[PDB]
Structure formats: C-alpha cells, structure tokens
C-alpha cells in the first residue's frame with residue numbers, strides 16, 4: 001500500500017512547468033490514495049530554500065528536483081535519504097554513466113537521474129541566411145559572421161549571457177582550460193587558458209559581435225533572441241519550448257542549433273541536468289521512493305521528451321522511435337555524449353560564484369582577464385583545502 005502526501009518541489013521553468021505538474025499528478029492514477037502536492041520553486045532560490053527547510057526540518061519537500069551538483073551538496077550535510085536497496089532504484093543500469101555519477105556521494109546513491117543536458121549555439125536561420133553567413137564553428141568565425149549580420153540585417157550576432165557563470169565554461173574549454181584536475185587535486189582555472197577565456201568574452205562584447213547584461217540575464221537573453229535583436233545565443237534544451245512560443249520560431253522551423261563555438265585550442269560544453277532526491281526527514285519515504293521510480297521511469301522520460309524535448313538519462317528511451325526521431329534530440333544527444341563532466345564533490349556547486357563575480361567585472365572593465373583568472377584560482381584554493 002501507498003498512501004499519504006508526497007510534496008514535490010520542481011525547479012522547471014515557465015515553459016516546462018505545466019508538463020511537469022501533469023506528470024507528477026499522474027502518479028495518482030496508479031496510486032489514488034497518494035496526494036501529490038506539486039510546488040514550483042524558482043531555480044535561483046531552490047538550493048537555499050531546500051537547505052533552509054531541511055535544516056529546520058520545517059516544510060521540506062518529500063521529493064526534490066535536484067541539480068546534478070546539488071546531490072553532493074545536500075548529501076554531504078545529511079539532507080538526503082540513501083536510495084540503495086529501496087524501490088526508488090529500478091533498472092538503474094539503463095542510465096547514462098555520467099548521469100549516474102552525479103547521483104553518488106561517498107559510495108552511496110542519493111538520487112535518480114531525470115534529464116541530462118549541455119549548452120549549444122542556437123541560431124535564427126532566416127537572419128543567418130539574409131546575412132549570407134554559415135553557422136560559425138569557432139569564435140573567430142562568430143566574430144566574422146556577427147559583422148556581416150550587423151552590416152546586412154542590423155541585428156547583433158550574439159547574446160552573450162553575462163550574469164550566469166555556467167556560460168563561461170564553453171569559452172574556458174575552447175581556450176584549452178578546465179576548473180580543476182580532479183585526479184591530481186590541482187586547481188587549473190588560473191592557467192593561461194582562464195586568462196584567454198576572460199579575454200575572449202570581453203572582446204566579443206567590446207567588438208560589438210555580442211551584447212550582454214549584468215542582471216536579469218535569462219529574460220534578457222530570451223527576449224533578445226525572440227525579438228530578433230540577436231541572431232544567436234548559447235542555451236540548453238530547457239529553452240526549446242520557450243523559444244518556440246515566440247512568433248519568430250513557431251514549430252522551430254526557423255530555429256537552428258549547433259555546437260558551441262571552438263576557441264583557440266579546441267571546443268567543449270559542460271554536462272548539466274537534474275536528478276530526483278528524497279528528503280532524509282520525509283514522513284512518507286515509501287510513497288516518495290515510488291514517486292521517484294515513477295518520475296524517472298522510461299515511460300515518463302519518454303513523455304518529457306515528447307512534450308518538451310528534454311533529454312532522457314535512460315539509454316533505452318533513445319531506442320523509442322518517438323525519441324530517436326526528434327531533431328532537437330538527434331543534435332543534443334551527441335553533444336551530451338561529448339560534454340565535459342565535472343568533479344562530483346560537495347564543493348562543486350560553490351565553484352560557480354567566483355566565476356560569476358570575476359566574469360561580471362571583466363565584462364564591465366573593472367578587472368583585467370589576468371587578474372580575473374588569478375582571483376578565480378585563489379577562490380578555488382580557499383574552497384578546496386586539499387587542492388594545490
């Protein structure tokens with residue numbers, strides 16, 4: 001028997017949330033004595049809100065949509081129920097290895113994978129065609145393309161997200177860099193690749209190839225792309241249905257997607273995504289395990305793709321013709337296969353704030369690329385006491 005309340009905190013965005021609420025409530029079809037209480041929690045607030053609730057054992061959710069870096073974060077402070085040997089885990093081996101890695105902390109499973117993602121270059125096909133340019137493969141090509149776009153159409157080439165540090169990573173990887181060398185416990189962000197990456201973002205804006213904003217970056221990016229103010233943006237699968245709501249991208253026929261541009265050394269995009277965790281203090285652990293199994297099942301992952309084009313973590317789901325033949329999936333899955341995995345460490349989540357501050361200050365001209373890289377390195381060494 002399953003009965004009682006399962007409160008689910010979902011972080012999905014305005015375009016995704018109706019789908020996720022319907023899926024969550026569908027758990028009640030097979031378990032009518034369970035009451036699913038769906039709550040949508042803003043992404044930026046959710047980590048803090050969960051810690052506040054879990055630390056005061058006061059209004060915590062039973063099931064938490066848990067960003068890949070939040071698993072080790074929450075788990076290290078005891079907020080997550082261990083899932084090994086529980087009904088929450090079913091056909092575990094189906095999940096992509098890199099998705100499974102993010103669910104683990106100190107030899108225990110604290111989450112089940114839900115979606116996997118990476119960043120890509122979205123582009124407005126009509127604008128590029130009008131400008132007579134090809135989708136750019138590199139930053140150098142992007143600069144050239146942007147000039148032609150402005151000359152021939154008046155649009156700016158790129159919206160460069162300046163207020164979210166995750167958007168720094170493609171530039172860092174393209175310059176031949178990474179945050180840390182996990183295996184050797186060495187901070188690497190302040191290597192010359194870090195300097196180069198901060199210089200690249202500043203040059204893109206100064207040269208007018210790109211525009212940016214120091215605040216409200218999600219809305220500003222989406223607005224600029226949807227309104228044709230820019231021809232390109234870097235974004236993820238969570239943006240697809242949001243973009244398609246716009247007059248300019250109905251049915252996605254005008255929406256192109258390609259890999260993030262290479263830099264001077266090579267090319268790369270980060271691995272991200274979401275898992276599902278159970279609050280350690282839940283008063284309905286059984287019903288929660290079953291809710292997690294349900295939300296992470298092949299059936300529900302397939303539905304999510306069909307409604308939202310989010311990428312399944314289950315390998316088996318990619319063999320479903322409906323998923324295999326989805327064009328956003330056909331592009332994003334290979335890109336995900338190549339995505340750079342991060343260290344799944346308690347402090348991994350905290351690696352982002354230092355980038356955020358230095359990136360803002362580079363873009364405004366308050367901080368040189370050289371100082372920004374050094375500052376980011378210093379911040380990491382403070383965070384990671386056993387890293388050189």
Ligand SMILES: OC[C@H]1O[C@@H](O[C@H]2[C@H](O)[C@@H](O)[C@@H](O[C@H]3[C@H](O)[C@@H](O)[C@@H](O[C@H]4[C@H](O)[C@@H](O)[C@@H](O)O[C@@H]4CO)O[C@@H]3CO)O[C@@H]2CO)[C@H](O)[C@H](O)[C@@H]1O
Pocket residue numbers: 011012013016043044045047048067068069070117164165166218236238271272273274348349350352
């Ligand atoms: O570490 C967590 C805290 O720090 C910052 O989070 C990071 C995060 O660890 C990174 O992996 C990356 O998160 C991205 C995520 O993986 C993507 O899926 C995407 O998230 C969107 C969801 O897909 C969508 O459903 C809805 O929830 O909106 C999300 C946001 O658009 O994009 C994420 C990046 O925006 O990057 C962030 C750094 O921003 C962050 O500071 C938080 O406060 C975390 O607590």
